[PDB]
Amino acid sequence: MIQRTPKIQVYSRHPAENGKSNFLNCYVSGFHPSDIEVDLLKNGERIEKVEHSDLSFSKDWSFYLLYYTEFTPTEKDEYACRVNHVTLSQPKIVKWDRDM
Amino acid sequence: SLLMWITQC
Amino acid sequence: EELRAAAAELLAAAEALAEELRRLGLEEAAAHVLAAARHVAAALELIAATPALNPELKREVAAHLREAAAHFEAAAEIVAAEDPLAGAMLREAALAARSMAAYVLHSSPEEALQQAAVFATGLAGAMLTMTGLVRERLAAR
Amino acid sequence: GSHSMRYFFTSVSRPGRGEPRFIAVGYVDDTQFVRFDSDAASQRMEPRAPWIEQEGPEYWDGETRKVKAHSQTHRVDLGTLRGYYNQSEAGSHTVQRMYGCDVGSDWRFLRGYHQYAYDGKDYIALKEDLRSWTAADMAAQTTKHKWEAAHVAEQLRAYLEGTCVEWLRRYLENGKETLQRTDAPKTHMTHHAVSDHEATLRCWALSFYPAEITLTWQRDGEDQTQDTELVETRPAGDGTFQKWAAVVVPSGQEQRYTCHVQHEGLPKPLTLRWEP
């Protein structure tokens, strides 16, 4: 059985300006197995509500998902995205960067 | 729309 | 669908399609649609009320499905001048009927029991969509 | 100037937890307009785009009915493919189906396609001639022979030739305000430094609707690709897309580096120079 590893990315819909509400996006595109546990994080604690895009595979037969959640950036906050997957031995946490 | 009748692989 | 009539709503949906189609264009298009509907309904009744089948019966079901496909294709020819996508849907329905008959021959009866329901389901959905489309063309006039 | 309509179907087998789940999505260009999910409150084709809601209830009943037919077909497909491949029922296997059609500026047919895969490897595809099935494995050959005997290729020809194209033209004409747009990328550039002897330059494109964009960072000479860390196109969720292409230059304080942005929105390939 073929399997692939996620390619995880974290960013914002709008450029990061403090005090302006933006949508944190965790976009993943590896996903050969559909089963997945991806959770956004703020200061090490998961955001209460997430909204997941529908599974749409590309021509490589690899899915991609987009978790977009409203938030307000702050000078001292490090948002992140955790991904637990079948291929991953341990959950992979990627940290938000204002200039990725 | 969609394909009307889809056969069984 | 396992009972005597697998899907008798095709006849009612095609009657609705005919009534919403009689207001525009000539009535022989509705005649072809309704004749194809009655052939499909007869084929579905014959295959559905099966003893579980006679190859000659298979041939007869193929004849009804192919004749309904011919009716659908003639209707597609005489409707495609107005609402071209409705004509394309009619052509797809005719080709689906031909392919369904070709399946009916080359399939075990137990394997075709579900596929008859699937074909009736798809054709009924397409008929409802076509009814809505010709209805909005009637409204636009 | 070209458009496209695509439908993606993913049926994932769940052994023990119940019947397999089904996800159906539909795209025009790069905007999603219909969705499905087996584990949903209302098992219907819920609209997403504003331009698809103009259709009457008959269209939605037909789409829901056809998707339910597809779901039954895919459940039986998982069963029969497990039968062919002689795999144990404990494992999970994910049937995937694509089909759609593309049009040009004339809105006439250019290319229709229908692909089908069992686990990553493409199982049965439909060639550009729309006649013969490209099959890979022995079970794929068996199903190819079954479909050729059942005359399935002709129905897919009749669909992807007329029905898909006419539906696509209807979708574009109905929703020209959303699909026919072409937003120019709001490009900019950012700078960072590490260890004061080497600096990263990033060329950013923020908002643009067509997903096909070409960002090329290069030196005074042309085609400097080896040093570029280019990220795949990122959907922003608002329909616009983003992409950032970066290099890590050793010299620092350089006016020799250029960014070229090629996109449909830009009449001419836009050139960005680093601003001190």
Side-chain angles (χ1 to χ4, degrees), chain C residues 88 92 99 121 128 135-136, chain D residues 58 65 76 150-151 159 163 170:
Chain C
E92 185 182 1
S99 187
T121 296
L128 289 187
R135 162 184 311 186
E136 68 179 2
Chain D
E58 294 88 5
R65 187 171 291 172
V76 177
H151 295 285
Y159 174 72
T163 300
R170 163 184 184 80

Side-chain angles (χ1 to χ4, degrees), chain D:
Chain D
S2 66
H3 302 247
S4 53
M5 186 175 74
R6 295 186 296 272
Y7 282 102
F8 303 133
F9 297 96
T10 300
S11 179
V12 166
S13 66
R14 271 195 302 212
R17 278 86 68 192
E19 302 79 16
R21 66 177 294 165
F22 193 48
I23 299 94
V25 295
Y27 281 117
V28 176
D29 275 327
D30 280 289
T31 303
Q32 190 166 101
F33 66 99
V34 290
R35 64 180 177 179
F36 198 64
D37 192 359
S38 179
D39 293 331
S42 66
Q43 288 182 344
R44 274 162 86 73
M45 296 298 286
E46 292 179 353
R48 285 184 179 270
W51 54 266
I52 196 66
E53 293 153 333
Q54 280 104 45
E55 309 282 350
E58 294 88 5
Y59 169 71
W60 295 120
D61 300 316
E63 291 292 327
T64 297
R65 187 171 291 172
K66 262 176 285 173
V67 170
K68 275 184 208 145
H70 274 98
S71 175
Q72 307 293 340
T73 289
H74 275 118
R75 292 180 67 252
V76 177
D77 273 355
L78 295 162
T80 315
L81 287 153
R82 187 181 68 190
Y84 288 113
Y85 269 70
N86 290 316
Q87 309 209 331
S88 296
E89 66 270 15
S92 179
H93 314 107
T94 63
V95 166
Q96 300 176 0
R97 183 190 314 265
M98 181 189 291
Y99 57 84
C101 64
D102 296 1
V103 300
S105 58
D106 57 0
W107 289 6
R108 286 215 303 121
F109 175 65
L110 293 178
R111 181 177 180 270
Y113 48 92
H114 179 263
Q115 305 184 352
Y116 190 90
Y118 182 66
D119 275 309
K121 182 176 174 66
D122 52 352
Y123 185 74
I124 291 169
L126 185 63
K127 292 183 176 67
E128 304 325 313
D129 283 337
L130 298 173
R131 289 179 178 88
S132 65
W133 300 101
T134 288
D137 281 323
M138 184 178 72
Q141 293 291 324
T142 301
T143 300
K144 153 176 200 181
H145 266 305
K146 185 176 179 180
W147 280 353
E148 288 182 353
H151 295 285
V152 192
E154 286 91 19
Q155 171 187 10
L156 271 72
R157 174 176 286 173
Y159 174 72
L160 309 166
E161 181 66 27
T163 300
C164 179
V165 172
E166 284 302 325
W167 270 109
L168 194 155
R169 301 181 56 250
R170 163 184 184 80
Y171 290 140
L172 303 190
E173 160 58 50
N174 193 0
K176 65 177 74 67
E177 293 293 328
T178 296
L179 270 296
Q180 295 180 357
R181 68 182 180 178
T182 304
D183 282 31
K186 293 188 286 184
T187 62
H188 69 71
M189 176 174 329
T190 61
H191 180 76
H192 196 30
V194 285
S195 69
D196 293 331
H197 291 170
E198 187 176 2
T200 72
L201 275 297
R202 305 201 162 85
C203 193
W204 271 71
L206 291 172
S207 284
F208 55 92
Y209 168 65
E212 173 180 12
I213 192 167
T214 301
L215 295 175
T216 301
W217 194 279
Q218 69 185 2
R219 300 177 69 187
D220 59 324
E222 292 181 354
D223 190 74
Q224 185 66 42
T225 303
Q226 297 292 321
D227 292 331
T228 73
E229 183 179 1
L230 191 149
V231 173
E232 65 183 2
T233 308
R234 305 185 301 174
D238 199 3
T240 44
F241 293 70
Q242 328 180 338
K243 184 184 284 186
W244 65 275
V247 296
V248 181
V249 306
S251 178
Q253 190 45 53
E254 293 297 75
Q255 297 297 110
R256 295 172 64 251
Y257 287 97
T258 58
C259 175
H260 296 339
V261 186
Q262 293 180 357
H263 183 235
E264 295 200 301
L266 297 172
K268 187 262 287 181
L270 192 149
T271 299
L272 290 175
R273 173 154 321 282
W274 153 245
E275 190 273 331

Side-chain angles (χ1 to χ4, degrees), chain A residues 9-14 21-27 39-42 47 50-51 66-73 78-81 94-97, chain D residues 236:
Chain A
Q9 316 166 44
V10 179
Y11 53 88
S12 297
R13 181 176 291 176
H14 285 307
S21 66
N22 286 342
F23 295 171
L24 194 65
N25 294 318
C26 192
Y27 172 83
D39 291 330
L40 291 174
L41 287 178
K42 66 186 289 184
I47 296 89
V50 296
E51 294 179 353
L66 180 66
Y67 298 183
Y68 60 97
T69 61
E70 188 164 31
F71 80 100
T72 59
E78 184 73 340
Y79 301 95
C81 187
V94 293
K95 295 169 72 175
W96 185 33
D97 204 320

Side-chain angles (χ1 to χ4, degrees), chain A residues 3-4 16 18 20 22-23 30 35 37 39-41 49 52-53 56 58 63 87 90 92-93 96:
Chain A
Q3 56 196 3
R4 300 187 191 66
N18 270 328
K20 183 175 174 66
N22 286 342
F23 295 171
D35 279 306
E37 184 176 1
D39 291 330
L40 291 174
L41 287 178
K49 62 182 181 292
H52 62 87
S53 178
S56 298
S58 66
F63 299 163
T87 63
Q90 186 177 2
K92 183 175 178 181
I93 296 168
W96 185 33

